[PDB]
């Protein structure tokens, strides 16, 4: 009873002290920077092969790989550069939401409504790409999968719970808790030592991975929040939500910096990423369009107009030198 | 593909597309269809012809030259929303409703209605079972259709009161373009594999009119 | 594990035919291309046929177009030579071996035991200048060979792999493009080269590098190889 006159006592002070460090909005210091102009991108590539949706697609940390999930059953691995299929993995269960490519390129992960995340080895002395490990322990669907290491993996289920893997031993490391709602994506830090993820609460925290604890949480969002990623510098991060909207945080200061809403824009952002200097920020939306949004001002710097159904996911080559959409449309497209 | 190696290389990726082709053939003749309903409803007990293969549960059979798929989500326990739209392309949504369970057919109501007005499926029909007859012929002599449905106002024979339960169900389309083969089933009744696929077949016609623009 | 064993070969009369065959265990044999490489008495390595995966491709040697040729049975996962009119200059060691081409792969990895076959009685030049080269263990050691043609090409990728034959084993992969350490071999070994010049060093040599060294250019068929580079111990 009391404790409940507690918990709103203590929110309040996180809002009053939140209140205090705010002298000057974002859109307000950066009013004087130039614009970045209309940011005219074509299509380059097309890779084409896919069936089914697709729902899921990671790009190599070499710059060239690609990996892209659809639900087809199939994971198939290409080459960007020559469109050439270097893989084609069959899956155990065709109903698949995410993929990863370790930063290694030696293992690519899986999952989705089975509730397992699959880990497949590549570079075996067999010549064909095995199933390594299952992971299992989740009771609701699998929404993302990052590698931290060839023995290592952060995993999201609608169960409104992260965990933490050791693919050698196979059991859950460490749980994460305290969403109350479908965990729907997450975003590793540079540095591999914290990460953020997006719930249907509407909401996002920060997890220190080491510690297993919520070092914060940040609102804002109307709706849930259906993708995330984190600033390339590792001190903020945007959230794509169905609102229609995106917002960017600020992991010191602690609160919210900018939005990203237009009067034209009605429906809600499936996927969102950055570029490599951080200025631009690439969200697919369920109109068949792609944003590119100046990131320190919020105007709409361009459209990749493409594809005949939704975007579903994007991605940015550590380089920066290209862009890669999937749709349901059941193609994937390269951008620069 | 000029050099010897990235002509190799260009070899295996067409004996790739080659495989997908050839897989994509083969799972061509399969209609999906989406299981739906609350617990106890007889959903995992439909076709007898079962051939099974936590999380999504899958049953294969086969039917007069056809293969059938039915993907019961049950034990998800999360929001549909979320992993609902992942069944969009299915041909068919296959409903069950128990008659003698009056508790949860508030339940069931309000599932078949939040599911039928799904944006999602503005027009994929359903296939609405409506099980255990005998049960509730024999329930609803000791018990009168009036405690799970205050407002009901005809006789208490099993004819009217089977009627009025389906009118509810048929009652919450309010949507054109889509429709509801409400049946009938019991306990022992081999024949639910031929309502699913005549079903099925008027589904596919009706689909069919709209590709060759009659429609 | 991985286990190619070859059979079929033996003495025969000049003008004869014969037929090895290779029989792979421990693999996904339709997945990958096979060669016919031969290495007559105390010569050196020649490469002879290729068939691709799915049996797409077929190369021969100029030597051996022909009167021979090579069939692979998927099912049965064997792998087969036909050998119609043999000269006295066909008499080697025959060996089986397995590549696998997709970007970032190591198509050379796995050497069959060999065969030997007994007889009665253009094209890219790859030199190794030295034929023995003494040492002791614990001293740096280089070795190089040239080529006729620049093994570069527009992809950046330089076509160049070192194979090391132990006294009485097959070879061995040891760098596959022009300084990729192939998987098992310690990371002692380096390459590096441009153009035309290439050199393989060795650090820390140790008891177990005794042997011969051959250079081979992948960059076009035929595939030839070089002289070979011996250590003496």
């Known amino acids: 009873d009391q404790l409940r006159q507690e918990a709103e006592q203590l929110k309040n002070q996180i809002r009053d002290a939140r209140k205090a460090c705010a002298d000057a909005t974002l859109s307000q210091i950066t009013n004087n920077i130039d614009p970045v102009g209309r940011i005219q991108m074509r299509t380059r590539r097309t890779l084409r092969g896919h069936l089914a949706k697709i729902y899921a697609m990671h790009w190599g940390t070499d710059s060239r790989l690609l990996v892209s999930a659809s639900q087809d059953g199939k994971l198939i691995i290409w080459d960007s550069y020559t469109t050439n299929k270097v893989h084609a993995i069959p899956l155990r269960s065709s109903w698949v939401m995410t993929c990863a490519y370790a930063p290694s390129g030696n293992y690519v992960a899986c999952g989705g409504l089975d509730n397992i995340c699959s880990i497949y080895n590549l570079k075996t002395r067999e010549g064909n790409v095995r199933v390594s490990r299952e992971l299992a322990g989740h009771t609701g669907y699998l929404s993302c999968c990052r590698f931290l290491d060839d023995n290592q993996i952060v995993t999201s289920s609608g169960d409104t719970t992260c965990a933490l893997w050791d693919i050698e031993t196979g059991q859950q490391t460490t749980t994460f808790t305290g969403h109350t709602g479908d965990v729907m994506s997450l975003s590793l830090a540079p540095d591999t030592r914290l990460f953020v993820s997006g719930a249907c609460d509407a909401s996002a925290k920060l997890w220190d991975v080491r510690e297993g604890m919520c070092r914060q949480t940040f609102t804002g969002h109307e709706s849930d929040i259906n993708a995330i990623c984190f600033f390339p510098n590792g001190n903020a991060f945007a959230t794509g939500s169905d609102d229609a909207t995106c917002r960017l945080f600020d992991l010191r200061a602690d609160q919210e910096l900018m939005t990203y809403s237009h009067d034209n824009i009605i429906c809600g952002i499936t996927s969102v990423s950055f570029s490599k200097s951080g200025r631009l920020l690439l969200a697919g939306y369920d109109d068949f369009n792609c944003n590119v949004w100046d990131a320190l001002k919020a105007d709409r710097a361009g459209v990749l107009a493409g594809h005949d159904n939704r975007v579903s996911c994007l991605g940015v080559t550590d380089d920066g030198m290209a862009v890669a959409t999937g749709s349901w449309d059941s193609f994937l497209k390269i951008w620069n | 593909t000029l050099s010897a190696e990235e002509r190799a290389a260009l070899e295996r990726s067409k004996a790739i597309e080659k495989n997908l082709k050839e897989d994509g053939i083969s799972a061509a003749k399969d209609v999906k269809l989406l299981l739906l309903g609350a617990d106890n409803s007889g959903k995992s007990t439909i076709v007898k012809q079962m051939k099974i293969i936590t999380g999504i549960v899958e049953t294969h059979f086969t039917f007069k030259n056809l293969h059938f798929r039915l993907f019961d989500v049950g034990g998800q326990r999360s929001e549909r929303k979320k992993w609902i739209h992942c069944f969009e392309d299915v041909t068919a949504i296959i409903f069950c409703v128990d008659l003698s369970d009056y508790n949860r057919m508030h339940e069931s109501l309000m599932l078949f209605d939040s599911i039928c007005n799904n944006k999602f499926f503005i027009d994929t029909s359903i296939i609405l079972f409506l099980n255990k007859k005998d049960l509730f012929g024999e329930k609803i002599k000791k018990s009168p259709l009036t405690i799970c449905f205050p407002e009901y106002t005809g006789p208490n024979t099993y004819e009217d009161a089977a009627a009025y339960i389906q009118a509810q169900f048929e009652s919450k389309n309010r949507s054109p373009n889509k429709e509801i083969y409400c049946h009938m089933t019991c306990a022992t009744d081999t024949n639910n594999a031929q309502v699913i696929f005549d079903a099925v077949t008027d589904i596919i016609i009706a689909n069919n009119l709209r590709g060759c623009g009659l429609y | 594990d991985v286990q190619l064993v070859e059979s079929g070969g033996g003495l025969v009369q000049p003008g004869g035919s014969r037929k090895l065959s290779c029989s792979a265990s421990?693999?996904?044999?339709?997945?990958?291309?096979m060669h016919w490489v031969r290495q007559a008495p105390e010569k050196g390595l020649e490469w002879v046929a290729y068939i691709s995966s799915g049996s797409g491709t077929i190369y021969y040697a100029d030597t051996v177009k022909g009167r021979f040729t090579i069939s692979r049975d998927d099912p049965k996962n064997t792998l087969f030579l036909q050998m119609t009119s043999l000269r006295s200059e066909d008499t080697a060691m025959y060996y089986c071996?397995?590549?696998?081409?997709?970007?970032?792969?190591?198509?050379?990895?796995?050497w069959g035991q060999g065969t030997t076959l007994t007889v009665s009685s253009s094209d890219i030049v790859m030199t190794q200048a030295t034929s023995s080269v003494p040492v002791t263990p614990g001293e740096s050691v280089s070795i190089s060979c040239r080529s006729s043609?620049?093994?570069?090409?527009?992809?950046?990728?330089?076509?160049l792999y070192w194979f090391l034959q132990r006294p009485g084993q097959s070879p061995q992969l040891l760098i596959y493009?022009?300084?990729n350490l192939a998987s098992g071999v310690p990371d002692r070994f380096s390459g590096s080269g441009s153009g035309t010049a290439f050199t393989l060093t060795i650090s820390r040599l140790e008891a177990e590098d005794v042997g011969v060294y051959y250079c081979m250019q992948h960059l076009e068929y035929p595939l030839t190889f070089g002289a070979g580079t011996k250590l003496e111990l």
């Open positions: 071996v397995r590549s696998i081409y997709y970007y970032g792969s190591s198509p050379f990895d796995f």
């Open positions: 421990g693999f996904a044999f339709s997945s990958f291309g």
């Open positions: 493009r022009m300084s």
């Open positions: 043609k620049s093994l570069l090409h527009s992809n950046g990728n330089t076509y």
